[PDB]
Curated annotation (Swiss-Prot):
Free-text comment on this protein's domains from its UniProt entry: Interacts with the snRNP via the Nop domain.
Places the protein is found: Nucleus
Protein species of origin: Saccharomyces cerevisiae (strain ATCC 204508 / S288c)
Function field: Promotes the association of the U4/U6.U5 tri-snRNP particle with pre-spliceosomes to form the mature spliceosomal complex.
Transmembrane regions: none
Listed name of the protein: Pre-mRNA-processing factor 31
The family this protein is said to belong to: Belongs to the PRP31 family.
Portion held of the full protein: 284 to 353 of 494
Subunit (UniProt): Component of the U4/U6-U5 tri-snRNP complex composed of the U4, U6 and U5 snRNAs and at least PRP3, PRP4, PRP6, PRP8, PRP18, PRP31, PRP38, SNU13, SNU23, SNU66, SNU114, SPP381, SMB1, SMD1, SMD2, SMD3, SMX2, SMX3, LSM2, LSM3, LSM4, LSM5, LSM6, LSM7, LSM8, BRR2 and DIB1.
Gene that this sequence comes from: PRP31
RNA sequence: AUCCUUAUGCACGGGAAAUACGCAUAUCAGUGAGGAUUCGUCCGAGAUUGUGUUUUUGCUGGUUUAAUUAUAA
């Protein structure tokens, strides 16, 4: 169900295999926050950082090397 | 006091390899790299990028003739 999410297939094909392993973990931790949040008050701001890391690190995985001097 | 287990250092002795060993004011990475599956799950530390040398590193071995001096005159 994750491989069909937005944060994976919005990126080029070659990056998919690494994003699953990268996204799955960040999903689990999110759930591990949700178990600890009290029912009365549920709060974000961990998932904001955790989208930042994933999107940026994905741009970086897609960025390709710089050119090399002959 | 003896005996034993693990890890590390030094070392005698015995092998195997040098397409092998390293380096980085560099990018990520147990806050999950990289894989595996019998589809339930299972394993758990490197991967990228640049670069140095790599029929080779250091050191060695082999091969290409002294002086003195003696006759009977």
């Amino acid at each position: 169900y994750l491989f069909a999410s937005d944060m994976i297939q919005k990126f080029p094909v070659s990056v998919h295999k690494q994003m699953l392993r990268m996204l799955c973990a960040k999903v689990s931790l999110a759930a591990r926050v949700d178990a600890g949040q009290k029912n009365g008050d549920r709060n974000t701001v961990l998932a904001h950082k955790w989208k930042a890391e994933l999107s940026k690190k994905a741009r970086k995985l897609s960025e390709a090397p710089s050119i090399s001097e002959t």
